[PDB]
Amino acid sequence: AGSRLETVGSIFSRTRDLIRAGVLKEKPLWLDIYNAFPPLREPVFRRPRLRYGKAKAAVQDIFYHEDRIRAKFYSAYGSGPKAFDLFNPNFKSTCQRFVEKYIELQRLGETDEEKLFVEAGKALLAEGVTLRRVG
Amino acid sequence: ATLNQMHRLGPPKHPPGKMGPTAGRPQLKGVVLRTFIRKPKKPNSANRKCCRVRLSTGREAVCFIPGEGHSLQEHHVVLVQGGRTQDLPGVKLTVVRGKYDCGHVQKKK
Amino acid sequence: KNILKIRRRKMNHHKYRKLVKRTRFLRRKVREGRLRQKQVKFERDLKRIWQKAGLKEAPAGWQTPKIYLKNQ
RNA sequence: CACGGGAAACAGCAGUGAUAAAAAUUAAGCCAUGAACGAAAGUUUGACUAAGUUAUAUUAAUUAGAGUUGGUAAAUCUCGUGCCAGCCACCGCGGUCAUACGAUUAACCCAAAUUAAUAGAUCCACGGCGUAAAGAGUGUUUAAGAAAAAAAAUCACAAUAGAGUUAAAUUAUAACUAAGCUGUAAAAAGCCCUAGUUAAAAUAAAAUAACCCACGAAAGUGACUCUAAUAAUCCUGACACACGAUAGCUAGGACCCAAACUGGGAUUAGAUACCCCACUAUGCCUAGCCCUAAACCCAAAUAGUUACAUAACAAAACUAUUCGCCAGAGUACUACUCGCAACUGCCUAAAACUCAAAGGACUUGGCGGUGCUUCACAUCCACCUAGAGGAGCCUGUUCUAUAAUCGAUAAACCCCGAUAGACCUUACCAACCCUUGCCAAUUCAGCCUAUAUACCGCCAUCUUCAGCAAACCCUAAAAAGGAACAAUAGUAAGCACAAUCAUAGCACAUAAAAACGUUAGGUCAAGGUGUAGCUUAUGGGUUGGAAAGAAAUGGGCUACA
Numbered sequence A: 001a002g003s004r005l006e007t008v009g010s011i012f013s014r015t016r017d018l019i020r021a022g023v024l025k026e027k028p029l030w031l032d033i034y035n036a037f038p039p040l041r042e043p044v045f046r047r048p049r050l051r052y053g054k055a056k057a058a059v060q061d062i063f064y065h066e067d068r069i070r071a072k073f074y075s076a077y078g079s080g081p082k083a084f085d086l087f088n089p090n091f092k093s094t095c096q097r098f099v100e101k102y103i104e105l106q107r108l109g110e111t112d113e114e115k116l117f118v119e120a121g122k123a124l125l126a127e128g129v130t131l132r133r134v135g
Numbered sequence B: 001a002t003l004n005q006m007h008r009l010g011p012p013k014h015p016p017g018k019m020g021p022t023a024g025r026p027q028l029k030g031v032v033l034r035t036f037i038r039k040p041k042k043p044n045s046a047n048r049k050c051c052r053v054r055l056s057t058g059r060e061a062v063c064f065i066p067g068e069g070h071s072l073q074e075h076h077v078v079l080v081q082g083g084r085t086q087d088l089p090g091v092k093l094t095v096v097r098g099k100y101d102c103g104h105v106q107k108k109k
Numbered sequence C: 001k002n003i004l005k006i007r008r009r010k011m012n013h014h015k016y017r018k019l020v021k022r023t024r025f026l027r028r029k030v031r032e033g034r035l036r037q038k039q040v041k042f043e044r045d046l047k048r049i050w051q052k053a054g055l056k057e058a059p060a061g062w063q064t065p066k067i068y069l070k071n072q
Numbered sequence D: 001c002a003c004g005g006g007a008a009a010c011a012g013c014a015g016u017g018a019u020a021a022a023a024a025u026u027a028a029g030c031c032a033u034g035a036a037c038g039a040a041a042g043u044u045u046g047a048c049u050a051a052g053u054u055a056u057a058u059u060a061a062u063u064a065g066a067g068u069u070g071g072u073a074a075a076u077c078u079c080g081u082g083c084c085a086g087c088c089a090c091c092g093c094g095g096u097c098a099u100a101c102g103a104u105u106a107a108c109c110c111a112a113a114u115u116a117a118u119a120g121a122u123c124c125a126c127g128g129c130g131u132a133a134a135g136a137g138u139g140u141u142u143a144a145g146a147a148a149a150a151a152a153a154u155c156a157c158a159a160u161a162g163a164g165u166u167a168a169a170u171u172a173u174a175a176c177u178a179a180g181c182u183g184u185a186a187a188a189a190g191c192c193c194u195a196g197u198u199a200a201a202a203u204a205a206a207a208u209a210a211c212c213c214a215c216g217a218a219a220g221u222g223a224c225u226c227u228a229a230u231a232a233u234c235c236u237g238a239c240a241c242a243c244g245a246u247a248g249c250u251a252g253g254a255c256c257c258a259a260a261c262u263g264g265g266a267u268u269a270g271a272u273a274c275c276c277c278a279c280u281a282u283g284c285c286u287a288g289c290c291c292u293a294a295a296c297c298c299a300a301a302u303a304g305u306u307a308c309a310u311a312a313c314a315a316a317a318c319u320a321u322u323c324g325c326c327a328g329a330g331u332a333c334u335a336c337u338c339g340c341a342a343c344u345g346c347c348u349a350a351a352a353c354u355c356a357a358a359g360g361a362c363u364u365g366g367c368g369g370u371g372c373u374u375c376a377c378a379u380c381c382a383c384c385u386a387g388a389g390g391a392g393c394c395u396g397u398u399c400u401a402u403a404a405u406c407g408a409u410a411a412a413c414c415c416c417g418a419u420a421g422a423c424c425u426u427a428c429c430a431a432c433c434c435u436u437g438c439c440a441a442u443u444c445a446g447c448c449u450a451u452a453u454a455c456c457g458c459c460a461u462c463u464u465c466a467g468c469a470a471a472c473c474c475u476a477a478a479a480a481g482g483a484a485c486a487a488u489a490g491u492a493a494g495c496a497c498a499a500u501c502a503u504a505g506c507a508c509a510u511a512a513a514a515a516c517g518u519u520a521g522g523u524c525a526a527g528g529u530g531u532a533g534c535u536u537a538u539g540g541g542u543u544g545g546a547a548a549g550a551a552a553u554g555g556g557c558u559a560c561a
């Protein structure tokens, strides 16, 4: 008839092989299509073991230097006045403005944190944004 | 075990066969002391004809008489052999029918 | 389940302790006897030694202590 | 051993006594080889050569008999037997339909052999140790080994030993006050030199913190303070060394409270127990022994990995180096040994013999004087009404009784087969009779003879219980299980339930219905029948008899006004 072993191979494997053995006398559509543009990974069954011991996953946490800045921003001023619009693809927040200013004053060569930070706050007050801070 | 431990004990050796009722001989010759009857064990019942024999090795032992019917009196010499009778607990020997004073079973007449 | 095994031993042990209580002074006698025997075989072992060495009497000042018959 | 001494030698070939399950000729030649001797021709040789004997084994043909036929494991039919007689290597067979006994018929398989008995050959672990046999109560070193690449020794907390101290209880003991106090599911016994309050040394034991997880090698350690203090530049390692819960022993001291034992009280058929009261050894301190625990986290130490990969259950699977252990179950934490301050001891640890299993985990049932929910509707308790059990009768059982039926006989028998026995009915008893003896025919009629544990027929019962069951599909395997509705693997025809029908309109009630199975439930005496029995009788007829109440009891009737 066919092969109901899900665990043994891919559907591709089992199908091709069952044709090979002359059991399955008609080639199925999806077969030719499959051969033509096969998937990236063979869809063979695999059992999901729980990890043990010292082993952990390989997944990298996502950070950028800007973050190192944003933290100081949020610690100081909390979330900004402008709220957030996660619908608007190009939306820039108050934090992001502060970031860009800080980066620009970094390019003038001031290596002190205080100078960069406060002067970026000033550069922002210039444009008309209010930093109410927090205690 | 580990390789050392296996080195230290040597390989395993097959224990010699422990010896039975006939003392490793195929038959024994013995004289009949008494003829009696024994009940089998529980699950299945009859009353089995046995005798007591004294054997050439001087050891005295219960022994069983095959076939239906027999003539055996004290002082008859018989020849006994090793088959153990499954019903009877304790009875490890069997009279050889057809030798010395135990004759072959007589067909019904 | 496993207790069946334990139970068996349990019984065995009980019955045996009981028996040692009944059979006690019989047992006393037999053990004292074995101790005397032991002491004797020991003495013989020693005597045998100083004789096979050609000496007649045991060497000077040799009392051959009583080790097994040692007071309880 | 052989000077000596027992004593008078076949373990040369044949023979022979004895003995054993065990059985070759008291034979012929030196012709060949070998050996001895000879210068040599040669002689001698039970070595040996050629023969004799024997199914011991092969082979060849002249020779056909043995074993087996329940499964393993090739092959069976009809009688006889009836848990008897007997059979089997192992499982097992035999209780009236035996392929398993015994014999016959057929077959199978070996074959001049075939079975049985006994010894071999072969066969255990380069496997395992949470739950099955097995990680040895703890650590250190010795011997012996591994080092095989990269590093490390180290800081809250209840280690251990000393010495000192005490908050909460409790108690000696007085002072008031009260007659009781104590004690249980309930009592009794005990105590009233008792109880409540107020005062209190000693002794012992260490709420809360702790929902913490520390210290120690383990056993163990959690009131407070101080002193001393927790090996190794860290692999494994004993039978050597040093420790080791509780209990127990010796000696001296303590004693609040607990308590084996014992004595009282209940309980019970008994109660040498559980429950109540008293009280002792003992639990404590000092010193010495003893060396055992379900000393179990039932999971060895040291380094590692999370790759391969589910027997089951459990605490997922594994590598390397080691050491300790384990070869069916009982017998056996036993008997004997050695050692030990142990003397009813610890340690070490068999065999005869017995068995064909013993074990481990699971599965579905059933059950549970187990827990939690929910119920019972004439139904358990609470409750309502009328009765039974006592009387007389009526009628049935059981007994006893007779020459004198049978059947039912917990629920699910007992005014039951019987909506029906004076003769008949009728099957029983006793006398008598009749033997192709109901019929178209029949070496045949006939049988209320045995078996309801061979049955059909009818039923009872769980039951006004809700399940049974074909055909499929699913499950890191399946013995079996298969639902989740905001749905997770189930679809299912069929039979039951349900619905309809009946009780002359609905409705309700009642009736009817109620599967698969359970009780080898009831009935060979409704009838019919399988198997086995009788045949001038276990068959067919006639006449007459079947009594009876010591006693026990069921159900009714009539009453007691």
Ligand SMILES: [Mg+2]
Binding pocket: B043, B044, B045, D083
């Ligand atoms: Mg039987």
Ligand SMILES: [Mg+2]
Binding pocket: B083, B084, B085
């Ligand atoms: Mg036999």
Ligand SMILES: [Mg+2]
Binding pocket: B098, B099
């Ligand atoms: Mg003969």
Ligand SMILES: [Mg+2]
Binding pocket: C008, C011, C012
């Ligand atoms: Mg026993």
Ligand SMILES: [Mg+2]
Binding pocket: none
């Ligand atoms: Mg000699």
Ligand SMILES: [Mg+2]
Binding pocket: D010
């Ligand atoms: Mg001879």
Ligand SMILES: [Mg+2]
Binding pocket: none
């Ligand atoms: Mg000689």
Ligand SMILES: [Mg+2]
Binding pocket: none
């Ligand atoms: Mg002879």
Ligand SMILES: [Mg+2]
Binding pocket: D022
């Ligand atoms: Mg022979």
Ligand SMILES: [Mg+2]
Binding pocket: D023
């Ligand atoms: Mg002869």
Ligand SMILES: [Mg+2]
Binding pocket: D030
């Ligand atoms: Mg010659």
Ligand SMILES: [Mg+2]
Binding pocket: none
């Ligand atoms: Mg010659």
Ligand SMILES: [Mg+2]
Binding pocket: none
């Ligand atoms: Mg001659």
Ligand SMILES: [Mg+2]
Binding pocket: D087
């Ligand atoms: Mg036979």
Ligand SMILES: [Mg+2]
Binding pocket: none
């Ligand atoms: Mg028969």
Ligand SMILES: [Mg+2]
Binding pocket: D100
């Ligand atoms: Mg057979």
